[PDB]
Amino acid sequence: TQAVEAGEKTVEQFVQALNKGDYNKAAEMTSKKAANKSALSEKEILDKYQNIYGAADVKGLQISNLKVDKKDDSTYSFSYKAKMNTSLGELKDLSYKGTLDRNDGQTTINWQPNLVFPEMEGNDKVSLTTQEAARGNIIDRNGEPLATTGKLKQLGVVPSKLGDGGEKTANIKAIASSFDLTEDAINQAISQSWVQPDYFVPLKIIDGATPELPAGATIQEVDGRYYPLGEAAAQLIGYVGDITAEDIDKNPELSSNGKIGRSGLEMAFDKDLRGTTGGKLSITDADGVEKKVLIEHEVQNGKDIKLTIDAKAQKTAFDSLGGKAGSTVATTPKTGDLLALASSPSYDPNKMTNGISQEDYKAYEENPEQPFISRFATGYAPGSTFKMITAAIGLDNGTIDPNEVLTINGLKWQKDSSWGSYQVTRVSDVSQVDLKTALIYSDNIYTAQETLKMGEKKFRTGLDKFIFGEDLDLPISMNPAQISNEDSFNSDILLADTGYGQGELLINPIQQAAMYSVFANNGTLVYPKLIADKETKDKKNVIGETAVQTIVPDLREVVQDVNGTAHSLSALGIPLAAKTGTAEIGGGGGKENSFLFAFNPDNQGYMMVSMLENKEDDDSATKRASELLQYLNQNYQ
């Protein structure tokens, strides 16, 4: 058993070297080239493994059921089952056999071609045929395409037909002025290292009508990924890019010639959209006749994925932001169907997947407003819109009397002199403020007082009945909401700030639309839903129905009362219950975020949560919501 265990260690080190891709380390574990020992030399074994395993993208060689005994005084036989992953799938149940050589004081492997693949002999070759799978489509709730593989117009130039001296400079300026291109960019494209005099040098993709083609201009039809909404859904859908040799090392089942999702849903649903590579991995004879077929299966195209998004609401919600930093979430609050997940500013995903320059990509990454951010999935302080939750909690535990009137003098207020210079600030100097008045005028001092009067324990008890700390079942990279950094505020100031929603709270717009959905389901929290076919999961008795039937009538007045903060939305003439909010936030000035929550209190057909990050002066989310509220009130009742 002394040499048997030394032989078992030799087989394990040989497999481990093949599994790690170190073929030279595995080849040096073989005996000398002979007839009763190894078949090839060490350098020939290296080239055979590197060519065969490299062509099939073999990765993850692991063995089992290893048995090593003894055949002669110096020969030990070994056998084992093995498994490996290739570019066509998993090779399961591979019976490997061989012999060892115990000359000198170390044990080597009598290498044979059957150690590459089980039934290989002599000068047998390995052939791999593959068929690329078509990437599945991403569609909205009504079948409209959001991410599709279609035909594109590739506008390029042939430098031979461009001219010589003077005529070449005139045609470059003619194409640059006819397709809105830079004159120096066309010269740089035709002067790269890969360019030859007659090579078709691609320039840009034409997503419309093709104008007149001057001398040297030509258009060719190529197939690629196309995003109809473009930047309107760039953060949600994402983009796909060319698969690199490093991506194949991570997952061999990818197509070493296709596309892979880099961000958004194209990446979160990459496996379900890319399908499976079809083809056949066969062992051929010395010429080219197949002996045995190892792996073979038909190509399967990627399955289409249907979202709850509305293609027209996603475009309207994005355009309403006007390119400013912000986000908008539109849901059907009774089922959680995410009708729109807009984020602004945004990037062009079509330009991203169809060749983007280093300057345009650097302009996206170094933009101070950061268009790459999925703002609907980024945690923010909910702002003074959070009064609705604090009030509903205050009504459930009997802390807040809807008819009790607090006397507030001025625009600033603090509990004691222990607060130092900090004071809760409000915008409207209303002396007699009750619950309805504080919701109409968005009075933070009222909310700050009722929160301290409620206490931390009773406040967290009502907050814990929501979705704080929960990871939502959504294919969107997202962190769970939090009430504070730790489980205790340990500060009356932080408790009051959390009352009107700007302490250490972190709730992204999707999680906000889930928490605010209780006012459309009589206190029942309906979780958001992005996939059209999934079931509607809900959370009952989050707040009392009494608080819903008390705050929702006041939220109507936030729109209808002439001093309401959302009174500009009464121009719509539709049943609206809204609530505005602001949040004061590395240097800089008053980084203020304008929020807006609004829904239909008559039919609960739609719910909207929009916000503007670092708002400009005189700008607000309420000013930009008139267009989206009309479409949601018309098509979602």
Side-chain angles (χ1 to χ4, degrees), residues 1-8 10-19 21-31 33-35 38-42 44-66 68-69 74-80 82 84-91 94 96 98-101 105 107-150 152 154 156-163 165-166 169-172 174-176 178-179 181-203 205-206 208-209 211 213-218 220 222-249 251-270 272-279 281-286 288-291 293-302 304-361 363-411 413-414 416-452 454-470 472-533 536 538-583 585-637:
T1 59
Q2 296 80 16
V4 171
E5 295 167 349
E8 291 175 334
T10 303
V11 178
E12 292 167 357
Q13 293 168 318
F14 178 76
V15 174
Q16 175 245 19
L18 292 181
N19 174 81
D22 203 332
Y23 301 134
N24 182 87
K25 179 172 173 292
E28 294 193 8
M29 303 193 60
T30 64
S31 51
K33 180 194 187 68
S38 295
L40 301 180
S41 65
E42 295 184 357
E44 292 173 350
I45 295 172
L46 202 172
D47 283 67
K48 177 154 291 300
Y49 275 118
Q50 196 171 244
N51 281 269
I52 297 180
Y53 284 176
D57 296 323
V58 172
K59 175 187 174 57
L61 173 59
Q62 51 192 19
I63 66 179
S64 58
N65 195 15
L66 177 60
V68 177
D69 47 74
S74 303
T75 307
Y76 301 88
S77 60
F78 66 91
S79 60
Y80 56 82
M84 60 177 58
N85 189 32
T86 69
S87 56
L88 282 185
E90 189 78 14
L91 259 176
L94 291 186
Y96 284 92
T99 52
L100 302 171
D101 179 61
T107 301
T108 59
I109 301 126
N110 298 330
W111 191 92
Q112 293 299 320
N114 56 17
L115 299 185
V116 178
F117 284 135
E119 43 245 347
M120 278 188 56
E121 62 183 37
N123 292 326
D124 279 355
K125 319 300 187 60
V126 179
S127 177
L128 173 61
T129 303
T130 50
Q131 317 162 31
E132 303 190 39
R135 170 169 276 264
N137 298 340
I138 308 179
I139 54 181
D140 78 329
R141 64 186 300 103
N142 294 328
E144 293 286 65
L146 302 180
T148 316
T149 302
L152 310 177
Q154 177 75 80
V157 285
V158 263
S160 60
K161 314 171 191 174
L162 199 54
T169 312
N171 294 326
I172 291 181
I175 297 175
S178 180
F179 303 93
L181 300 177
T182 308
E183 297 182 352
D184 291 329
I186 301 182
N187 286 270
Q188 182 185 359
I190 67 180
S191 60
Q192 281 292 338
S193 57
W194 68 270
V195 179
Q196 289 306 311
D198 287 73
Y199 277 4
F200 173 83
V201 179
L203 299 183
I205 296 298
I206 301 181
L213 292 317
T218 171
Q220 298 181 358
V222 294
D223 292 337
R225 197 61 162 177
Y226 178 77
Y227 305 103
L229 295 187
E231 58 179 5
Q235 291 87 355
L236 173 62
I237 302 302
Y239 67 97
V240 298
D242 293 330
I243 303 193
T244 66
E246 291 77 358
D247 294 326
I248 303 296
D249 190 16
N251 186 24
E253 303 186 16
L254 299 171
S255 180
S256 57
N257 194 26
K259 298 289 187 177
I260 182 180
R262 295 302 187 184
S263 70
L265 292 181
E266 290 277 25
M267 179 184 58
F269 283 145
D270 180 62
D272 298 315
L273 288 174
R274 64 185 144 100
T276 58
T277 303
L281 176 67
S282 56
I283 302 177
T284 62
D285 208 3
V289 178
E290 299 181 3
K291 292 177 52 187
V293 175
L294 298 178
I295 311 178
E296 175 182 348
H297 43 65
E298 200 76 41
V299 55
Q300 283 183 323
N301 298 325
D304 289 0
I305 294 185
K306 191 172 186 179
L307 304 175
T308 57
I309 303 291
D310 191 323
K312 193 171 179 181
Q314 176 75 17
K315 177 187 174 185
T316 299
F318 174 81
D319 294 335
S320 290
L321 300 185
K324 310 300 175 59
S327 61
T328 304
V329 173
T331 72
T332 61
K334 289 184 296 182
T335 56
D337 287 56
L338 298 166
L339 297 179
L341 296 178
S343 181
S344 181
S346 188
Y347 63 99
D348 190 9
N350 296 280
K351 191 227 302 179
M352 200 82 162
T353 185
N354 301 332
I356 178 178
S357 58
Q358 283 283 79
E359 300 185 18
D360 293 1
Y361 177 71
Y364 286 156
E365 283 188 334
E366 302 200 25
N367 192 323
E369 298 178 4
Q370 293 289 297
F372 283 151
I373 294 187
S374 300
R375 286 182 161 81
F376 48 83
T378 308
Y380 301 110
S384 55
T385 313
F386 206 69
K387 296 189 192 73
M388 311 176 306
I389 303 305
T390 304
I393 296 170
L395 297 183
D396 291 336
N397 54 23
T399 300
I400 293 181
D401 186 10
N403 298 328
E404 190 186 51
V405 174
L406 295 181
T407 300
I408 308 175
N409 299 325
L411 298 175
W413 174 91
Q414 62 180 10
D416 311 320
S417 61
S418 56
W419 285 24
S421 57
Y422 182 82
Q423 287 180 286
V424 177
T425 310
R426 62 178 186 170
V427 293
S428 299
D429 187 7
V430 181
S431 186
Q432 304 301 303
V433 180
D434 59 348
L435 177 60
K436 176 178 173 180
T437 298
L439 295 182
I440 292 176
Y441 292 78
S442 183
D443 198 310
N444 296 337
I445 297 186
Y446 177 90
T447 308
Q449 288 191 9
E450 296 292 341
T451 302
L452 297 176
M454 191 187 313
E456 178 176 4
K457 175 182 288 295
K458 277 193 264 287
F459 184 42
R460 290 187 173 273
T461 297
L463 287 174
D464 292 330
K465 285 198 281 288
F466 281 90
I467 59 175
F468 289 102
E470 301 187 12
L472 306 182
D473 183 15
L474 294 175
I476 298 180
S477 184
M478 180 185 306
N479 282 333
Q482 73 171 29
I483 299 176
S484 58
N485 291 10
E486 307 297 331
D487 300 333
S488 301
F489 296 116
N490 300 120
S491 175
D492 287 2
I493 295 181
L494 180 54
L495 174 60
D497 294 359
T498 310
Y500 55 106
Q502 39 183 305
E504 296 176 350
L505 285 166
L506 290 175
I507 311 175
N508 56 67
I510 294 180
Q511 293 168 342
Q512 298 186 53
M515 294 177 53
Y516 298 161
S517 64
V518 293
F519 303 97
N521 302 276
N522 297 277
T524 297
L525 190 150
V526 176
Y527 288 94
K529 180 200 302 178
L530 185 54
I531 306 303
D533 55 72
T536 304
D538 58 75
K539 189 174 184 298
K540 301 183 301 179
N541 293 331
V542 174
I543 59 171
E545 191 176 356
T546 304
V548 178
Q549 297 172 351
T550 304
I551 296 179
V552 175
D554 296 338
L555 296 185
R556 292 174 176 262
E557 288 289 314
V558 188
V559 185
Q560 293 300 324
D561 193 303
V562 76
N563 282 335
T565 56
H567 181 54
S568 54
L569 294 184
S570 63
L572 296 170
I574 62 180
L576 269 181
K579 181 63 182 69
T580 75
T582 48
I585 309 302
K591 316 296 218 313
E592 222 181 39
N593 293 10
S594 176
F595 299 84
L596 172 62
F597 158 79
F599 77 105
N600 194 321
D602 290 6
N603 53 32
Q604 298 83 28
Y606 67 93
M607 177 166 293
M608 174 191 183
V609 173
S610 176
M611 74 97 66
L612 259 56
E613 181 183 12
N614 191 20
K615 57 174 259 300
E616 299 176 344
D617 297 2
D618 306 328
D619 196 6
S620 64
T622 312
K623 195 194 66 175
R624 308 176 175 274
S626 60
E627 292 173 327
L628 182 61
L629 287 178
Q630 292 186 37
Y631 176 82
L632 294 179
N633 187 85
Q634 169 71 13
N635 298 266
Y636 294 96
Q637 294 159 312

